[PDB]
Design a binder for this molecule. Structure first.
Ligand code: HEM
Length: 346
């Protein structure tokens, strides 16, 4: 097929199935979302340069936006101004640090970026959308009610790519080391290192060190460090936290982007298999059925023990993580720890 052909095929599908979102439609059309979006260029999308160092700070020009980051089973939507942005010297790491938009950006796999200005009945819905080497969405930022609409066009023109294009280059997915079996992991060393952890940020390196998958290490850590929970407990913890006003942290990401909410959750709702947070500045959409394992995890650090809940899919990938709200230098709060431990292990 061609990009003109793809665009047409998609519009035909959406006419048939207006509930279908871009990501769903792309799958039905047997292409990546990135490809689908590129089929839009010259119609209602403009391809931008992948110049993250200029683009990311510039989004701050737009005022309050909505940032959307998801994986297969969980969608995180947070509202606020896109600041404060810092991008590393080597241009491979980005941060957005603020009480609202709070992001960790791993720019290396970021491949293509488009500015979309989509006709609505009456207005136009504008978004910046980023895609990875495989065409899978990385991160999106949506203009909303309160955005500075006049920043839009100058931003697009400044970042507009020379070759507008509608094809999109994609790379074949890169090496998966085969997992070791549990019996091949040095469990004592891993536990020793676990006990020695000084900052929750060092966890990743610890896994790399012993060659263990994250779920695998939890399994081998022992009950004092990690315990499996009934999968249905996660929604219940949200419900209990809603009940008390406890400020929590909710981490949701994919291989290339992590988005964080800090604060309480208040308004919660089920719709079918979806468990939802539905607050004015924060929406969360969790497909509970996609959760294969749920762990309570405890990690030592310089600020003391940090307790979190970590939900995984069938592939061993993290859906969402919960912590208590905390500043580096402060220990976690008792109310959080009490709630996190209140639930019975399997
Ligand atoms: C700039 C200041 C930063 C602040 C204030 C911050 C704050 C936090 C806090 C409070 C937590 C949870 C509580 C704790 O574990 O101590 C956390 C966890 C985390 N942060 Fe950061 N962070 C920062 C920078 C970064 C950076 C640069 C990265 C790069 C990836 C990152 C990635 C993570 C990840 C993955 C976790 C989850 C840890 C786990 O698995 O236990 N953060 N951060």
């Amino acid at each position: 097929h061609s990009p003109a052909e793809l665009y047409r095929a998609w519009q035909d599908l959406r006419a048939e199935r207006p509930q279908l979102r871009a990501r769903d439609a792309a799958a039905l059309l047997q292409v990546s979302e990135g490809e689908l979006v590129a089929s839009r260029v010259g119609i209602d999308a403009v391809r931008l340069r992948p110049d993250w160092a200029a683009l990311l700070p510039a989004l701050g020009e737009l005022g309050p936006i909505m940032a959307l980051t998801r994986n297969e089973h969980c969608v995180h939507e947070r509202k606020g101004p896109y600041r404060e942005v810092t991008v590393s010297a080597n241009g491979q790491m980005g941060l957005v640090v603020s009480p609202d938009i709070d992001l960790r950006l791993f720019l290396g796999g970021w491949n293509a970026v488009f500015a979309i200005a989509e006709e609505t009945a009456r207005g136009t819905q504008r978004s910046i959308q980023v895609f990875d080497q495989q065409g899978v969405a990385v991160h999106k930022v949506f203009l909303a009610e309160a955005s500075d609409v006049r920043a839009w066009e100058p931003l697009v023109e400044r970042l507009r790519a020379a070759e507008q294009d509608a094809v999109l280059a994609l790379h074949e997915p890169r090496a998966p080391a085969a997992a070791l079996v549990d019996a091949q992991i040095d469990a004592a060393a891993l536990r020793e290192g676990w006990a020695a952890l000084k900052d929750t940020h060092h966890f990743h390196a610890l896994l790399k060190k012993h060659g263990a998958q994250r779920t695998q290490a939890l399994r081998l850590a022992g009950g004092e460090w990690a315990e499996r929970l009934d999968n249905g407990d996660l929604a219940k913890l949200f419900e209990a936290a809603a009940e008390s006003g406890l400020p929590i942290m909710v981490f949701v990401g994919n291989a290339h982007c992590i988005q964080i909410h800090t604060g309480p959750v208040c308004n919660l709702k089920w719709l079918d298999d979806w468990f939802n947070v539905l607050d004015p500045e924060f929406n969360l959409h969790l497909k509970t059925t996609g959760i294969a394992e749920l762990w309570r995890v405890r990690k030592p650090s310089t600020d003391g023990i940090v307790t979190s809940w970590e939900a995984f899919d069938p592939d061993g990938e993290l859906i969402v993580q919960l912590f208590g709200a905390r500043k580096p230098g402060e220990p976690e709060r008792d109310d959080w720890r009490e709630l996190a431990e209140s639930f019975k292990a399997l």
